[PDB]
Structures are given as structure tokens and as C-alpha cells.
Design a protein around this ligand. Structure first.
Ligand SMILES: [K+]
Ligand SMILES: [Mg+2]
Ligand SMILES: [Mg+2]
Ligand SMILES: [Mg+2]
Ligand SMILES: [Mg+2]
Ligand SMILES: [Mg+2]
Ligand SMILES: [Mg+2]
Ligand SMILES: [Mg+2]
Ligand SMILES: [Mg+2]
Ligand SMILES: [Mg+2]
Ligand SMILES: [Mg+2]
Ligand SMILES: [Mg+2]
Ligand SMILES: [Mg+2]
Ligand SMILES: [Mg+2]
Ligand SMILES: [Mg+2]
Ligand SMILES: [Mg+2]
Ligand SMILES: [Mg+2]
Ligand SMILES: [Mg+2]
Ligand SMILES: [Mg+2]
Ligand SMILES: [Mg+2]
Ligand SMILES: [Mg+2]
Ligand SMILES: [Mg+2]
Ligand SMILES: [Mg+2]
Ligand SMILES: [Mg+2]
Ligand SMILES: [Mg+2]
Ligand SMILES: [Mg+2]
Ligand SMILES: [Mg+2]
Ligand SMILES: [Mg+2]
Ligand SMILES: [Mg+2]
Ligand code: NA
Ligand code: NA
Ligand code: NA
Ligand code: NA
Ligand code: NA
Lengths: 113, 57, 126, 117
RNA sequence: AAAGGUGAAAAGAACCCCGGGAGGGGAGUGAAAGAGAACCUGAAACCGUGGACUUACAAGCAGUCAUGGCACCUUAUGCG
RNA sequence: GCGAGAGCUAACUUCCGUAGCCGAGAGGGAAACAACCCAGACCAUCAGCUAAGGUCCCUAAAUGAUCGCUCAGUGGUUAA
RNA sequence: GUAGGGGAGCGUUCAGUCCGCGGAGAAGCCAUACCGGAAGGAGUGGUGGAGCCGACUGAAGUGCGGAUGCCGGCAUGAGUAACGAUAAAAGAAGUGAGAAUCUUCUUCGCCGUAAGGACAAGGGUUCCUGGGGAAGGGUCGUCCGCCCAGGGAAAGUCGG
């Protein structure tokens, strides 16, 4: 078979620098457009990241800094975003698929908070 | 080159092969906001709504 | 009647609802793929499908559709709410031969096909 | 003085090609394959002129022995029963008689039996 | 190496419609645009659209002969 | 095929003599098959008689007549 | 009926001669169910837009399915194999008729005895600026080492 559990597009360091870069991006900008797949892949990673940061303990922060190597952003998610997302069970992230593209013909989508 | 074909193929055969190449027509919907036709489970590229309006017109 | 000469100066010979894009830098075959979906159906529908078909022939095919409509409406004074793609088709144009270097010294020739996308609109007529 | 081959080869070729009607494939569209078909075509045409006669004869017989059998005789017995009597010498067309007019052919059979035993 | 050809003469398309363009449709010039400038004729391979008659249990050098069905009647309502 | 040599009285073998056919020979028969059997195609025909071969069915033509054989599927691969 | 010999003719170009046809229209091309014993010939229609049948006679660069023939065009393989080092990239913003591919920003990654820098040889405007988007660019392209115009190169002592 192949009944595993994740996606891959490149190697091992890649899917990482990706998920990180994109998580940072979204956290910073509140909404981004990207390929529907990359979006799908980002959803749970970032949801989980809110839940970590959603703790307040310096630990939780120092955890979050492993992924978000941008200070302004760590502070944002930590002190602003997490707090706000305090009463809702989990995960406020949603995906809206725009439409096909011209360059390569790939369906695009928007992920946002 | 080992992968060579014996005879040239007939118009007939060479077309029967292509009898599976017909693109499907995009099933389009009517947008309940700006009466424009859009793609199901997507966002109306015209007015920009999808239950209230998301993208910039 | 008269003969073969007079008829020539008495009639100029018009093409009701006819548009052609000649020399389109695409291979006929693909464009056939795109056109096939419009073969004999509402011009409205036509415009709508071309707007979503993920192929790139879509564009020029569209542009020509519109130019036809334009003609039927301004040069032929037809009723656009009854317009439809009576007939449409793609002919091969001249070809762009290019010399593409292969291995070991041998060369080939890439063939860059072109197209004369034509489309002709018409009132349904019940 | 020079003499191109102009217009000659075209016409020859077109004559050939126009022969090709129900001709499948390039048999009907590429000269060489056309002409080439036309050879073996010759063969069939000429032999079939001779063969069609065999065919038909066979047909007529196949009907005649049936007729014969409808009463209680056969083809051997029946024709033979027209040889013994210089009377009946139809032979040709007889099939049409057994196919259209049954009564007539019955009379012929009865005649054949009467001119035998 | 290959490569010729608008028209009698440029009057070789002001203006309008689609399009970034290319391209095209009108209008006008001209005998002619069925000569429109990658313009005398425009064969064949080759690609395609429309129509008629047909094809999804048979082994096919792709014909030939015979018969039946369907369709069309400008050398041609009965010969094809 | 006949008459010889050579060869194991082998070879779709080879080398001579002689007859016929193929080569340049269509047609019928032998399932198919150059040679074998019958027969040498001037052309046309919804005419008739025969040859070699056959006459249950798949192709045309007596599941014909009388007197025998063979229990074998011999016919439808061979000998001491 | 093969090699081969013999006989009678068809067709094409040029030439002489004769009868002629052509703007209400030649040749050529396209269709066709007619004629002749064959090569072939003719009527009608369509296209075409200038020249050309028939008869007789003379002369040939005179008849093509083949030669792994020559030239040219177009097919099949098929929307197939590939798109040229496995140093991946992501988001925002801008421009635009049109951006995955151009511009800017913030990150990410890779070379760093180089994948940095400066010369000789060699290539000759490829530099700079402003335009352009046919073709080149292995995709797009608004960009480019591509196209167009304009500018730029300064020696008593560094090379000769
Ligand atoms: K124009
Ligand atoms: Mg690593
Ligand atoms: Mg006029
Ligand atoms: Mg006979
Ligand atoms: Mg021998
Ligand atoms: Mg010989
Ligand atoms: Mg036989
Ligand atoms: Mg007999
Ligand atoms: Mg006998
Ligand atoms: Mg029988
Ligand atoms: Mg046995
Ligand atoms: Mg003139
Ligand atoms: Mg010669
Ligand atoms: Mg050849
Ligand atoms: Mg070979
Ligand atoms: Mg060639
Ligand atoms: Mg595919
Ligand atoms: Mg394949
Ligand atoms: Mg594959
Ligand atoms: Mg590939
Ligand atoms: Mg490779
Ligand atoms: Mg690569
Ligand atoms: Mg890249
Ligand atoms: Mg090192
Ligand atoms: Mg210099
Ligand atoms: Mg530069
Ligand atoms: Mg370009
Ligand atoms: Mg390109
Ligand atoms: Mg100086
Ligand atoms: Na991975
Ligand atoms: Na068809
Ligand atoms: Na002989
Ligand atoms: Na045998
Ligand atoms: Na003719």
C-alpha cells in the first residue's frame, strides 16, 4: 500500500521551511492566496501553532519561536492573536478557492483567519 | 531505436484512438448576487461574493 | 442573370455573421479541442464557457466569438438575444519550421503550427 | 526543343483514381495504391465474367431439385425424365417455373414420372 | 543555395465595428476584392466543418460478382 | 515416371539418357499446394453436353440398384 | 505466353501550312452516368482572366510506381519523449489589455581557493538611457545578452 499521513512536494528541510514561511506569512498578513494544496497543508500546522501560542507561558512563546523566526510576528500571535482566539474551541482558519490560473493552470485559493 | 513502429498508422485508427479526447464542458452556475455565471464551490470572479463578499471586485 | 461578368458587378457578396482570426500561433488540434464545446450553441453560453475553460486557446477563440457577434450586430443588424454559433472551425495556417539541435551532431525540426480560427453566428430561427 | 510532361501524367492519374469509388483507404486516394488495386481488380473482373455463369446454373439447379422433391422425386430423376422424352427440353428457365408457377411444374413432374417407369 | 507575378493606371481601402495587437467584418475605389498588398492561375498529398447512406459476435491484400435496402435523376425515370 | 551411375536400393541428394509439365500456362480436380490427373484462356451471354473427379451436410450432383466383406472407427501412418 | 523479332496507331512540345475560335471570354484547373478496338477523344457546367484547338507535314530535352533515385511540400510515430545538473522556495506590494515567470519589499536557500574580484586572448556595441513585443528565449513574458533610436570610450609617464 501507502496508508501514511502527510504531504510532500520536495525533501524534508523543504516542507518545513515552507510550513514555517507560510505560517509566518499568514499570521503577519491575516490572509494569503496560494495553491489549494499548499493551503490545505498549511491549515492544521497553523491551527496547531495558534493553540501552542494560546498559552501565555514564556515556554509557549519559546516553543512558537522555533517556527516563527520573526520577532514582530511571534509577538503578534502571542500577545494579540492567541488572546483573541480564547473562547472558540479550536482553529479559526478557513479556505476559499478562487479559480484556475494562467501560468500553469493551477487552481488558487485563499487561506485566512 | 528499439521503440520503432512497423507501418504508419491509418487515419481511421489514429482517430479511433482520439475518441477519448473531448474536454468536459465546465458545469457553470448562476451567481445569486451579481447574476454572473460562476464555478461551483468557488468564488464568483465577477462581483466577488460567496455568501457575502470576500475578494476585491 | 446575364452572364458571368455582370453578376459580379451587380452583387458584392456578403458573409452574414462571420469572423476569422488568421495566423494564430497555436496548433489547430488543441484549438479544435476548445471550439468543439461551442459547436452549435447559444452565443451567451459560448462567452460563458470560454471564460472558464482552462486551456489557453480559450482566449483567441473568445476574441473571435466576440468579433463575430460584433459583426452580426453592427454590419448585419441581427437580434443578439437570438444569436448562436451556427458553425465554427479551425484550419491550419502556414507553419513555423525551427531547427532544434539534438544529440551527437544530428538536428531536428520543430513544427510550430498556426491557426485560422473562424466562427459564424446566426439567429436560431424557429 | 524541350517537352515537359505537363498535364499528361495528371490526367492519366486522374483517370485511374476516378475508378476508385467504394475503395477503402488510400486505395481510393493515393495513385499508386489505386492502380495497384486495379491490377488484381482486373483479375477478379475477368474471372468473374466466366464464374457468374457457374454460379447461376448452380442456383437454378438448387431450386429445381427442391421442386422435384416437393412431390416425391429428385433432380437426377427429374431431368432424366425429360431426356427420355424429346418432348420436354426446357432445361433453362425451369427454375423460374418451379418458383412462380407450382401447378405447371407439378405437371412437368407428373410427365417425368410418366416417361420413366 | 532558394526566391518571379496586385490593377489598365494606385485611385493600393478616408470613416465606422471587435481586438493591445495580429486578424477580420462593413463602406468606398475598380470591370473585377471570387485582384487586398506574405495579392495571376491555385493541381496533389495533407488537416477540417456540414450532409447522405452506414458500422459496436467478425478473422478482414481491402477487391470482384450477384442480389436486397436506402438516397439522388444536369450525358440521366429507366439506362443508370 | 522409366533406364543407370555416385550415395546407406538415404535426401525436396547429385550426375547422364529419354517422355511430359512448370519456366513464360489461365481454367476444373487433388482441403490448402509449380511439377501429379483432366485440360492449352480471341471477345460477349441469368444457354446445353462432357473429362479428371464426385453425387448425406458445410459447395453443384442418386442417405442410388444387386451380390459380398469388415466390430474395426480399419478407412484415416510402416514391418519382421 | 517471358527474353526476343515484326506490324499498325495514341499522346506531348517545337516548326511550316491551311481552316479558324476568343471580352457575350482562350489556355489551365474542377465535375460528369457520352463516344472509340487500345493509347484516348468530345459535349455540357463550374473556375479562370488572356491567348489557343482541328487537319496535314517536319523535328525531338516525347510519355514513369519503382532505381535505400533528385528537389519540394505534407503525413505516421502523438499531443507521445523531452523542456538541459535534486542550490526547493514563500508571501505582500506595484505595473499591465494580459503576470508562477517583470519591478520593489521582507524572509528562505546555494557558492564563498567560488558559483567573489581583476587581467590576457578572443567576440565587436553585446555597455548606458528611453522605447518596442513579430521572431530568438526549450513554458509565459509587461522582461532580456533579442528589435529601434540616441548616447558613452579622453593618456607626456599604464600596453605597443
Ligand atoms: K486593421
Ligand atoms: Mg538538510
Ligand atoms: Mg460598382
Ligand atoms: Mg461453362
Ligand atoms: Mg534436384
Ligand atoms: Mg527464367
Ligand atoms: Mg479450390
Ligand atoms: Mg449434363
Ligand atoms: Mg466418369
Ligand atoms: Mg446438394
Ligand atoms: Mg487410423
Ligand atoms: Mg486582361
Ligand atoms: Mg526523357
Ligand atoms: Mg517515387
Ligand atoms: Mg526498410
Ligand atoms: Mg523527402
Ligand atoms: Mg496525455
Ligand atoms: Mg506510446
Ligand atoms: Mg506515457
Ligand atoms: Mg516528461
Ligand atoms: Mg535530461
Ligand atoms: Mg530541470
Ligand atoms: Mg524559477
Ligand atoms: Mg573548498
Ligand atoms: Mg573595443
Ligand atoms: Mg542592458
Ligand atoms: Mg512575445
Ligand atoms: Mg515563447
Ligand atoms: Mg590615445
Ligand atoms: Na517533505
Ligand atoms: Na463527416
Ligand atoms: Na509450356
Ligand atoms: Na494434398
Ligand atoms: Na476529359
Amino acid at each position: 500500500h501507502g496508508k501514511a499521513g502527510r504531504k510532500l512536494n520536495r525533501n524534508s528541510s523543504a516542507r518545513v521551511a515552507l510550513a514555517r514561511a507560510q505560517a509566518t506569512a499568514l499570521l503577519r498578513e491575516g490572509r494569503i492566496q496560494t495553491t489549494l494544496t499548499k493551503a490545505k497543508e498549511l491549515r492544521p500546522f497553523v491551527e496547531q501553532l495558534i493553540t501552542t501560542a494560546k498559552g501565555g507561558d514564556l515556554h509557549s512563546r519559546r516553543l512558537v519561536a522555533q517556527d516563527i523566526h520573526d520577532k514582530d510576528v511571534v509577538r503578534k500571535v502571542m500577545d494579540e492573536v492567541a488572546p483573541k482566539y480564547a473562547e472558540r474551541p479550536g482553529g479559526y482558519t478557513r479556505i476559499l478557492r478562487v479559480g484556475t490560473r494562467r501560468g500553469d493552470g493551477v487552481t488558487m485559493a485563499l487561506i485566512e483567519l | 531505436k528499439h521503440p520503432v513502429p512497423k507501418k504508419k498508422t491509418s487515419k481511421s485508427k489514429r482517430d479511433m484512438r482520439r475518441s477519448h479526447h473531448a474536454l468536459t464542458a465546465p458545469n457553470l452556475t448562476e451567481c445569486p448576487q451579481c447574476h454572473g455565471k460562476k464555478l461551483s464551490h468557488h468564488i464568483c470572479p465577477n462581483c466577488g461574493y460567496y455568501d457575502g463578499r470576500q475578494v476585491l471586485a | 442573370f446575364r452572364n458571368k461578368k455582370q453578376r459580379k458587378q451587380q452583387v458584392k457578396l456578403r458573409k452574414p455573421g462571420f469572423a476569422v482570426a488568421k495566423y494564430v500561433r497555436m496548433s489547430p488540434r488543441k484549438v479544435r479541442l476548445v471550439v468543439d464545446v461551442i459547436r452549435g450553441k447559444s452565443v451567451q453560453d459560448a462567452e460563458d464557457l470560454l471564460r472558464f475553460i482552462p486551456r489557453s486557446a480559450s482566449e483567441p477563440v473568445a476574441k473571435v466569438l466576440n468579433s463575430a457577434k460584433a459583426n452580426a450586430l453592427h454590419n448585419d443588424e441581427m437580434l443578439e438575444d437570438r444569436l448562436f454559433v451556427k458553425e465554427a472551425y479551425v484550419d491550419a495556417g502556414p507553419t513555423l519550421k525551427r531547427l532544434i539541435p539534438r544529440a551527437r551532431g544530428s538536428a531536428n525540426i520543430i513544427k510550430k503550427r498556426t491557426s485560422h480560427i473562424t466562427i459564424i453566428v446566426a439567429e436560431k430561427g424557429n | 526543343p524541350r517537352a515537359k510532361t505537363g498535364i499528361v501524367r495528371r490526367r492519366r492519374h486522374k483517370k485511374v483514381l476516378k475508378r476508385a469509388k467504394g475503395f477503402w483507404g488510400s486505395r481510393s486516394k493515393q495513385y499508386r495504391n489505386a492502380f495497384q488495386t486495379l491490377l488484381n481488380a482486373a483479375t477478379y473482373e475477368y474471372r468473374d465474367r466466366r464464374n457468374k455463369k457457374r454460379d447461376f446454373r448452380r442456383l437454378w439447379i438448387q431450386r429445381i431439385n427442391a421442386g422435384a422433391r416437393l412431390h416425391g422425386m429428385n433432380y437426377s430423376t427429374f431431368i432424366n425424365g425429360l431426356k427420355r422424352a424429346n418432348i420436354d427440353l426446357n432445361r433453362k428457365v425451369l427454375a423460374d417455373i418451379a418458383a412462380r408457377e407450382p401447378e405447371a411444374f407439378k405437371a412437368l413432374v407428373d410427365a417425368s414420372r410418366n416417361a420413366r417407369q
